[PDB]
């Protein structure tokens, strides 16, 4: 289908619609494609799963259901007319679609139209109600009665097919069809009057049945075996978890870039048991307040640096103006987009992408000059006092940018030279 990365890149109108839906993706699009000059094909090539998510969101429809059984008219009846319900009725009933397609633009307007459609005999007839001859309905829609009957016979013709043999009761009734016994009672014949004409409950059963086979064929759209279904697994072997076990072998290697004796440890054990059974002194442990003073010096030396870190233990409040702040934010964001595309370039490992790496490296050099002239402008317009903040803030991304340049240069000298 239209599910390949090529087709997702091809659906430019869908790209247009989702771009118009988003806002920061718009701003990124003008800065890259319109301002910097990024080709669209590799703009969206980093956003293929998001394109797919939007395509799935747009390209889905709902289950069919009986609009008629659900919807009740509730004296002009009030209607909560939904265009989704209208199209539900339309592709539920092509007779209603054909009655629509020649009446709104040619004969009468839309509100008088759907007023006649609620008024009509075919409304309550195709609705879960036997049609009454007392009802006047809509005489214009009464011309569609024999057209819908033609549709009924045509749909019955296309639905009719040879029946699976074991299920088929026609084989049972035609097993001995030459039986001349006695017919059953009035009980077993269908509900008819004294004139023999039926009530039509078999007809409405046919209609709801035909609704179920329209559901079956809606499933059965573009979008031997008897032995297995007659086989019984009740007295058979259960399914075995064929899952593989895992065993471990463990040998940790030691790190890559004096010994006391048994006599020594025995005599020290002897000494420390002698001291333990000898004496414990309570107040001998108090330090001499100079070695304790150096202890305090070391502790407060730790405390000063660690609490200075703990002084700095939505984002933080900034002294930048909002225009310069957003400009450095968006330039940082698009330079991150460049560098992610550069990792796409370098980690591709293809000679095919060499001119892409070259032209993008020119774009990155332009980004470098943009950053330098940006820092120069903030320097000369602010006296460096917050341009220091701007440069320190944008420092790590340009550091990784320089890392990318040094990798490209070093690898260029490795393979070329």
């Amino acid at each position: 289908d239209s599910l390949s990365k090529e087709k997702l890149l091809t659906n430019l109108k869908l790209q247009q619609s989702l771009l118009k839906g988003n806002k920061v993706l718009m701003k990124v699009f003008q800065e890259t494609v319109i301002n910097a000059g990024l080709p669209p094909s590799e703009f969206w090539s980093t956003r293929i799963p998001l394109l797919r998510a939007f395509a799935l969101s747009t390209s889905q429809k709902v289950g069919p259901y009986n609009v008629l059984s659900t919807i009740k008219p509730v004296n002009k009846v009030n209607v909560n007319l939904s265009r989704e319900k209208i199209l539900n009725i339309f592709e539920n009933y092509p007779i209603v679609k054909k009655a629509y397609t020649d009446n709104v633009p040619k004969n009468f307007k839309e509100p008088e139209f759907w007023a006649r459609f609620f008024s009509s005999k075919l409304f309550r007839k195709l609705r879960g109600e036997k049609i009454m001859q007392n009802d006047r309905g809509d005489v214009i829609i009464d011309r569609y009665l024999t057209l819908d009957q033609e549709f009924d016979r045509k749909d019955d013709d296309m639905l009719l097919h040879p029946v699976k043999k074991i299920i088929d009761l026609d084989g049972n009734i035609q097993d001995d069809p030459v039986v001349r016994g006695n017919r059953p009672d009035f009980t077993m014949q269908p509900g008819v009057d004294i004139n023999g004409n039926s009530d039509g409950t078999v007809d409405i059963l046919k209609g709801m049945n035909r609704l179920s086979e329209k559901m079956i064929m809606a499933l059965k759209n573009e979008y031997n075996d008897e032995r297995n279904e007659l086989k019984i697994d009740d007295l058979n072997e259960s399914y075995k978890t064929n899952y593989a076990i895992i065993h471990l072998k463990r040998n940790a290697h030691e790190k890559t870039t004096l010994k006391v004796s048994n006599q020594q440890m025995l005599q020290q054990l002897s000494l420390v048991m002698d001291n333990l059974i000898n004496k414990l002194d309570l107040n001998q442990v108090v330090p001499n307040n100079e070695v304790s003073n150096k202890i305090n010096k070391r502790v407060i030396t730790a405390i000063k640096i660690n609490a200075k870190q703990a002084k700095h233990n939505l984002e933080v409040k900034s002294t930048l103006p909002i225009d310069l702040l957003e400009s450095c934010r968006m330039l940082h964001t698009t330079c991150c987009e460049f560098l992610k595309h550069f990792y796409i370039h370098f980690q591709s490992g293809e000679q095919k992408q060499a001119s892409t790496v070259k032209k993008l490296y020119n774009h990155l050099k332009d980004c470098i000059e943009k950053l330098n002239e940006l820092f120069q402008d903030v320097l000369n317009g602010d006296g460096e006092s917050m341009s220091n903040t701007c440069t320190a803030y944008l420092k790590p991304v340009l550091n990784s940018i320089t890392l990318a340049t040094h990798k490209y240069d070093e690898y260029f000298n490795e393979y070329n030279n």
Binding site: L12, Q16, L19, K20, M26, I34, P40
Partner: peptide
């Protein structure tokens, strides 16, 4: 507002211009 529409419809004809060329 309206100002996004002339941007994206100029880009519609720009994509067609590179499509024919």
């Amino acid at each position: 507002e309206e100002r996004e529409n002339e941007k994206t419809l100029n880009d519609y004809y720009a994509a067609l211009a590179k499509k024919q060329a």
